[PDB]
Amino acid sequence: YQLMCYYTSWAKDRPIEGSFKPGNIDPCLCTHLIYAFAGMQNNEITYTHEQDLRDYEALNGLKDKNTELKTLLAIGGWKFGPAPFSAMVSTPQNRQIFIQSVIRFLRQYNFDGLNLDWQYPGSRGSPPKDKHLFSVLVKEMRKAFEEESVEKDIPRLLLTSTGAGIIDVIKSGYKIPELSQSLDYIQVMTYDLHDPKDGYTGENSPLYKSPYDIGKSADLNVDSIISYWKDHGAASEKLIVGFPAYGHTFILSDPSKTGIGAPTISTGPPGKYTDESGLLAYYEVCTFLNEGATEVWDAPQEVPYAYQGNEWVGYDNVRSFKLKAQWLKDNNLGGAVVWPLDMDDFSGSFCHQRHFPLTSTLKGDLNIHSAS
Numbered sequence: 342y343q344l345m346c347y348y349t350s351w352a353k354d355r356p357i358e359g360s361f362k363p364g365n366i367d368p369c370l371c372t373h374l375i376y377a378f379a380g381m382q383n384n385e386i387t388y389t390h391e392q393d394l395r396d397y398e399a400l401n402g403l404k405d406k407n408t409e410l411k412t413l414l415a416i417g418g419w420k421f422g423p424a425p426f427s428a429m430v431s432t433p434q435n436r437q438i439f440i441q442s443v444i445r446f447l448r449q450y451n452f453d454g455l456n457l458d459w460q461y462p463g464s465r466g467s468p469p470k471d472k473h474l475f476s477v478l479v480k481e482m483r484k485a486f487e488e489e490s491v492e493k494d495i496p497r498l499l500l501t502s503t504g505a506g507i508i509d510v511i512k513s514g515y516k517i518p519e520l521s522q523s524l525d526y527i528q529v530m531t532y533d534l535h536d537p538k539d540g541y542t543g544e545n546s547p548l549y550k551s552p553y554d555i556g557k558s559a560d561l562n563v564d565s566i567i568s569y570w571k572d573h574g575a576a577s578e579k580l581i582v583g584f585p586a587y588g589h590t591f592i593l594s595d596p597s598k599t600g601i602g603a604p605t606i607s608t609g610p611p612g613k614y615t616d617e618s619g620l621l622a623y624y625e626v627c628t629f630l631n632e633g634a635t636e637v638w639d640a641p642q643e644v645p646y647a648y649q650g651n652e653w654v655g656y657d658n659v660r661s662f663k664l665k666a667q668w669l670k671d672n673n674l675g676g677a678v679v680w681p682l683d684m685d686d687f688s689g690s691f692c693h694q695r696h697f698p699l700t701s702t703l704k705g706d707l708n709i710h711s712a713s
């Protein structure tokens with residue numbers, strides 16, 4: 342199995358004790374490390390900020406301590422949006438320019454591969470044709486990586502891609518049979534399945550359906566999502582399950598109702614270090630628990646959730662990860678991806694359970710392999 346881990350670029354911009362630098366990561370903890378996000382300019386891959394080139398050098402410099410470790414560069418993301426991709430895949434000319442720049446760029450900075458993260462190739466403003474086009478880009482990109490590897494004579498560069506965790510998004514933007522043929526891996530976004538927008542309390546990455554999940558919500562769970570992918574042509578070995586190191590905060594309209602499906606008003610207040618609304622890193626949830634937040638286990642969905650006053654949090658802990666890692670033996674080889682690493686108690690300061698409690702669990706249960 343593979344233990345992939347995301348390293349956010351804006352993580353080192355958090356308050357000192359909440360700041361995570363690329364060289365602070367354990368080289369033997371993951372099998373694949375993915376870099377926050379790269380940018381695009383003139384249908385050419387490029388960095389987001391000059392500071393980045395220094396993160397690349399430090400990120401790949403870990404391959405000295407762990408020779409089997411592989412690093413990938415991710416382009417895309419939610420903020421990025423579909424617009425730039427739609428325009429880059431529009432013509433074979435633009436396509437060939439991106440692909441070559443991705444090769445030059447990746448080979449120059451010592452990356453072993455590229456992670457495409459086109460947030461939804463068929464929705465959010467992307468036309469239906471992009472479902473077909475996205476497929477073309479992959480087949481084309483896979484082929485050049487292949488030629489480059491033959492002529493230059495070096496291990497081929499990996500090509501992965503994220504995949505929707507929402508049925509209706511998968512149907513309009515992903516050609517799974519063809520895609521599962523050209524990609525090396527598919528990181529499935531099995532998280533954010535419920536958010537304060539829904540209007541009720543829900544869970545971030547539930548393993549199973551909730552006795553309250555009705556209609557399309559019945560599929561809003563790891564088990565159902567993975568099965569849809571598998572049933573539509575995706576190879577189990579190539580599927581990589583999403584493991585979030587954070588939770589989502591809601592605000593109960595009645596502190597009397599603190600269970601799943603409880604009526605909500607809005608997202609929760611920003612956390613001390615991760616400054617957003619609606620979220621809380623794993624280590625930030627530990628403080629919440631430590632300050633008297635009533636912790637309860639969701640048996641039907643196999644995940645935890647806690648609450649304080651009118652503050653509700655749906656997250657994941659070591660127990661939910663272990664339970665999820667055992668389920669992962671659905672020949673769901675390949676394995677899991679931690680999203681994001683910097684949101685795990687990397688220092689042991691907040692959750693007094695040593696470094697990377699969540700990732701350490703996945704690593705042990707997936708028996709991560711490394712002659713080091």
Ligand SMILES: N[C@@H]1[C@@H](O)[C@H](O)[C@@H](CO)O[C@H]1O
Pocket residue numbers: 347415417418419420458460503530533680
């Ligand atoms: N590439 C990022 C990932 O960090 C995240 O796993 C995915 C689904 O949320 O969103 C993307 O934009």
